[PDB]
Amino acid sequence: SEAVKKWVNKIIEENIIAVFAKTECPYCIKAISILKGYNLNSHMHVENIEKNPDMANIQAYLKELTGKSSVPRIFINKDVVGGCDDLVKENDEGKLKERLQKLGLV
Ligand SMILES: [Cs+]
Ligand SMILES: [Cs+]
Ligand SMILES: [Cs+]
Ligand SMILES: [Pt+2]
Known part of the structure; x- marks a missing residue:
């Protein structure tokens, strides 16, 4: 189904943070x-x-x-962060704040 893929793609492309x-x-x-x-x-x-x-x-x-296939599934500027455990690792180790800095969000 191309429709589904296009729908998901639009969500990821039109929002810097997509969950x-x-x-x-x-x-x-x-x-x-x-x-x-x-x-x-x-x-x-x-x-x-x-x-x-x-x-x-x-x-x-x-x-x-x-x-x-599990949720949450997290994308930041189309890059895969992953799940909540991945986000927690990036947050604790400073990578999340670096991501957001490079995007002008923080
Ligand atoms: Cs919002
Ligand atoms: Cs932190
Ligand atoms: Cs914070
Ligand atoms: Pt929204």
Whole structure:
């Protein structure tokens, strides 16, 4: 399905911070809260892919792009950050702030 891929691509390309998430997902909530703590709201988009008829196609494409089908799936300026554990590692080790600095976001 080209439509699904194009839809996912538009979300990633039109938002510097793009998070694919689902309902009642604690690690989604944690990752989003961490990102909002950098005052990134204006350049963030969160897409709930569970409330979507094509969830499985979206997840399969996210796995093709990132290696995992699970949510949260986090992209920053089209680069794959990964899941919430990946975000926590980057945040604790300073890489997240460097990412955001290079983008003029921090
Ligand atoms: Cs912060
Ligand atoms: Cs937003
Ligand atoms: Cs930090
Ligand atoms: Pt949005």
